[PDB]
Design a protein around this ligand. Structure first.
Ligand SMILES: Nc1ncnc2c1ncn2[C@@H]1O[C@H](COP(=O)(O)OP(=O)(O)OP(O)(O)=S)[C@@H](O)[C@H]1O
Ligand SMILES: Nc1ncnc2c1ncn2[C@@H]1O[C@H](COP(=O)(O)OP(=O)(O)OP(O)(O)=S)[C@@H](O)[C@H]1O
Ligand SMILES: Nc1ncnc2c1ncn2[C@@H]1O[C@H](COP(=O)(O)OP(=O)(O)O)[C@@H](O)[C@H]1O
Ligand SMILES: Nc1ncnc2c1ncn2[C@@H]1O[C@H](COP(=O)(O)OP(=O)(O)O)[C@@H](O)[C@H]1O
Lengths: 558, 26, 114, 548
């Protein structure tokens, strides 16, 4: 009776109509039987990657033994799993666990063939004694079978430290299934989840889940990553009745709450947002028609599901003269995709001027000084895979950064020294530059081609060239700066009353056509903010009472 | 009757260093 | 509290087994809340007899960690990582901060009489 | 005797009969026995490529010992295979000390064998190794031998470097037919005679990461492995070789043999599947590139130095991509450098490199460091006519010898590339004044060394339709996610031809133009409404634009 308490039965649990249907994956049951039906070195082990199904092999073996559909020396056998977490528990009087497990092995010696030991997670018998060298002569006597299941790397990190153990082993690889086998497994599981949650499932919503979850998340393998969307959709549909069945809408809505990619359905509020977007983006960047239209179209294409899912959504570069809005525009698209000016990754490659700075955006090699930390660009996108990424002043980076930036493009995934891959399949890479500033389009593109790698341009999208500026354009910029200076004065509730001759006098002054729009910002505060700031701390500008501005030959009085 | 008496350990992790390789600019 | 005086060969694992028995004999009720579950990784010298309880849908286990302490311990342990979800909680805005701060005002007026 | 349950032995097992055939390689054994009987230095290391059979060399040495052919001064030695997985700290040196103590408890013939010792070499062995009570036969790899043993050495002056090399084809055939009578046991078939040499010959070409002794073991043993399914035909065949090598490399089984006439007579209308237009140009190139494969000219010149000039936007570089992917079997094996900056004396040195110590050195040459690796490339030269006359001496010995010197001092070989020298002058003169401008622009000697100066032209107004057909073919493949089709209409397909020529660039607006109107209007359609899956998408012309 030495194992009646420390190990509950397993085949009798399957006989009482309990475990999962296991229809599919017939081959390696027959292969493990072909390994097992030998005279010596039976002792197999199921080894693969975590999640592709190793419970299901033993459950299917149990189902075939209960059904009696087995060959000759497998009929009416009883597989028994032993737990090494209740056997070790009460043992303190200097010898108890030793002779306890010895008596368990002695009772395993009693039956021949009918007993089959399946030790789950068999790297607990290497340690957890004070073990190993008490069952080790007992293995190669044909008494116990020792079927197990481990992870791929844990077998070669803990188990294979002793060579004299692998004589008592034989590896059995188990690969990940296909998409069609996932369709078959989902049709085979489509009875247990409708009884537990009393709702019915359309086969369209059954086929869309594994189809749609393959462009997205790749860290879990695919016998079960399609089960989770269906079960969460069943739970959400049970929530909504507290439209009575599931649909392909619900899979898309759950996966766009999960890992948080907003590539969901067409909710009707954002339809007028995406259509009327050139003016909504034109609320802060006034000017630059042909660039705003191109960026708007590259955003609009990826929402409709047209472009190839083997690239980023928009990976493009725009440049030109100085002070035009090339850094202003990237702050404007994230101000309505996110309504957050700080959810984007803005790194500056004007600091990577050496060959050994690449490690600060990819992470250190394992175990030197900072393998605890991790990278900077890599670890911030892996958590939320939707952020727009700037790259400011791509000139001054050493051209070994570009060797790492290359396989970001044209594949999607980026490796790191941690040992992983992070896939940038729907981010927006925006590259900025200030090359040349001495040609119209011939000389500056000649300098761009003289600065990069030759195919690095063809992998990009439309390389855009900006305009200059114009005296007609400059009035509304003054309107924006006056509105900003008014909204800055809204805490202490001051406001201004700006006359139209003053509003155009701000447009006559400050038109140096090589410095862009940035001298006007300085000129306004040289005119207005200094005089007001001198008056405000001298009394007489008590709050609420507004001030008008008036023209006086080169200043403007208040 | 038997006690466990957990023990300590010491971990080592060194650091690389780079050379700068100046260029005679001609 | 589990590791306190458990200085024998098997006392921690039998305490944990008693806790898991008093969770298992209930039907579906008790929802365990384990805050800072990077501590659940080691604590043996054991601590591995949670995988059959987790991978049967029998334990419920709501628990919150930080960001980097997740990848320092749990991403290092890629077999445990499958039996979990991830609910990413992000920072609120400034307007939602203002909406929060009108709710916590009564407690700060009670504790300090202002 | 107490370590044999923890270690292994291939001396007592050497009298069982578990040893392989020792066919071939009966000189390296003499080299090893010559190293082994000396006063110092008697610890050889076998250095070579992995997967060749250094283990088989040591097995053949033991098989020579158990019958006896070495002299009596090395009579009846015992050889131990070492368990290199038995320690992987706390074990990487702990069991190692007991093993070395049991070697110390010999005073005898317990000659060791450690495989891949460059991962195990720090200095704990050296006072015991240089004392002289053990003989350390080892096998390593060439590249890590320049990494591990030369900085962490401490005893590197106590080895001999026996080079084992790659086998020939016939020696591989002899070993492979020696290892033919083993596989009546695990698999059972009637072994075909010619399938052995067929599998070795077909594995010789395309497999690269594996090496010729066991590269013919990734064969036939695998060929009978998937033939286990037919007993769920008892002879293997060349198709049994072909369906393994074809369905592993993802390449269609068209060129299963004959790499000198097949796909040398295929240099035909399959160019027309990629190059629309320029019939006589395709004919002239197809003639000229197979004159070099007969072996009549000198062996050290470029395979084709032919060069052509005419308009832009024709196919002039579309022909270039069309022969890289066919003749070199690589999509990205072209090098397009532009000589549009080379007007000065300080600009030529960018395409060869700097001396060791100056400005551009780590990047190397602009030309040569992209030819040193992958020397199976087609090479273009855009816009030669603005180049300063100090390129043509560098460019001349390119097409006069098959050698050139780089910035370092190494040598590059141009004897298996293709040079193409393009330009854009001409295109208004028919044939006479264009060649007159060629003779006036260059020296007359520069044209005698070159091949044909074949002449391009414009495009037909009806033949320009099929280019837009191929662009619409590339269009519809992307929107298979919505599973749509697009029915194009030939009036609009005529309409895109006039507005997609612009006789200053050739025929280049089209990659932008097929995107712009069509894709943006249909993207607004799909995001708004009124179109679903399965839609044929009819297109037409509304007076000026192309409505839907
Ligand atoms: N062919 C299949 N048919 C149905 N379900 C399957 C199949 N293969 C695997 N599964 C499911 O996959 C799961 C079994 O995989 P696991 O054994 O859990 O993988 P694992 O790597 O061993 O993780 P552990 O160690 O068991 S926690 C169960 O949810 C099964 O229902
Ligand atoms: N079209 C525009 N609309 C509104 N403000 C503009 C516009 N163009 C320029 N500006 C202003 O000018 C400033 C330009 O900022 P940036 O975009 O950082 O400069 P830039 O054009 O990137 O020049 P560099 O070379 O990158 S420092 C912004 O702070 C804007 O307020
Ligand atoms: N002379 C030979 N006789 C028999 N087999 C050989 C011979 N040479 C090479 N082999 C084959 O190569 C294998 C041994 O190669 P080995 O020396 O172990 O290479 P590596 O050490 O790089 O793995 C054997 O499995 C054997 O079939
Ligand atoms: N026969 C042709 N086959 C395919 N594309 C063609 C052909 N003729 C013109 N084109 C178009 O012209 C472009 C190639 O132009 P290219 O040869 O690069 O001009 P350039 O002479 O400036 O190098 C392609 O994008 C292609 O669509």
């Amino acid at each position: 009776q030495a194992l009646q308490k420390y190990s509950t039965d397993l085949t009798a649990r399957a006989r009482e109509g309990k475990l999962d249907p296991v229809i599919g994956r017939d081959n390696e049951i027959r292969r493990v039987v072909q390994v097992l039906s030998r005279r010596t070195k039976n002792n197999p082990v199921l080894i693969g990657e975590p999640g592709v199904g190793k419970t299901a092999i033993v459950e299917g073996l149990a189902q075939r033994i209960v059904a009696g559909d087995v060959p000759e020396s497998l009929r009416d056998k009883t597989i028994v799993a032993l737990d090494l977490g209740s056997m070790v528990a009460g043992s303190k009087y200097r010898g108890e666990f030793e002779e306890r497990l010895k008596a368990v092995l002695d009772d395993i010696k009693n039956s021949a063939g009918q007993i089959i030991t399946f030790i789950d997670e068999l790297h607990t018998i290497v340690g957890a004694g004070a073990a190993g060298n008490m069952i080790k002569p007992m293995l190669a006597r044909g008494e116990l079978r020792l079927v197990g299941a481990t992870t791929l790397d844990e077998y070669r990190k803990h188990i294979e430290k002793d060579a004299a153990l692998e004589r008592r082993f034989q590896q059995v690889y188990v690969g990940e299934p296909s998409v069609e086998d996932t369709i078959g497994i989902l049709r085979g599981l489509k009875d247990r989840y409708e009884v537990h949650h009393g709702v019915r499932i359309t086969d369209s919503a059954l086929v869309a889940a594994a189809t749609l979850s393959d462009r997205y998340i790749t860290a879990r393998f695919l016998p079960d990553k399609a089960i989770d969307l269906v079960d969460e959709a069943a739970s959400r549909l049970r929530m909504e009745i507290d439209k009575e069945e599931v649909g392909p809408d619900d899979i898309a809505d759950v996966v766009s709450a999960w890992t948080g990619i907003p590539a969901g359905r067409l909710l009707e509020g954002e339809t007028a947002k995406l259509l009327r977007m050139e003016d909504e983006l034109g609320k802060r960047v006034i000017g630059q028609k042909a660039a705003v239209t191109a960026v708007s179209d590259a955003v609009r294409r990826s929402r409709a599901g047209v472009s190839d899912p083997n690239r980023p959504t928009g990976a493009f570069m725009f440049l030109g003269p100085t002070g035009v809005g090339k850094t202003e525009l990237a702050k404007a698209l994230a101000d309505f995709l996110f309504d957050d000016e700080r959810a984007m990754v803005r790194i500056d490659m004007s600091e990577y001027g050496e060959k050994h700075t690449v490690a600060r955006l990819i992470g250190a090699p394992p175990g030197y000084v900072g393998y605890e930390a991790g990278g900077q660009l890599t670890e911030a996108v892996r958590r939320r895979p939707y952020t727009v990424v700037l790259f400011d002043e791509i000139e001054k980076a050493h051209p070994d950064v570009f060797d790492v930036l290359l396989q970001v493009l044209d594949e999607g995934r980026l490796t790191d020294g941690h040992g992983r891959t992070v896939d940038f399949r729907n981010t927006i890479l925006i590259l900025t530059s200030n090359l040349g500033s001495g040609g119209s389009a011939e000389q500056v593109l000649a300098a761009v081609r003289a600065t990069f790698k030759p195919e690095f341009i063809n992998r990009l999208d439309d390389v855009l060239i900006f305009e200059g500026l114009n005296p007609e354009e400059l009035v509304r910029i003054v309107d924006i700066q006056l509105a900003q200076l008014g909204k800055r004065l809204a805490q202490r509730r001051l406001q201004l009353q700006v006359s139209l001759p003053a509003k155009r006098w701000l447009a006559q002054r400050g038109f140096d056509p090589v410095y862009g729009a940035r001298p006007l910002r300085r000129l306004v505060q040289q005119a207005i903010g200094d005089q007001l700031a001198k008056m405000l701390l001298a009394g007489q500008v008590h709050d609420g009472d507004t001030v008008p501005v008036n023209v006086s030959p080169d200043a403007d009085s208040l | 009757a038997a006690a466990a008496a957990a023990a300590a350990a010491a971990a080592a992790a060194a650091a690389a260093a780079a050379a700068a390789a100046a260029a005679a600019a001609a």
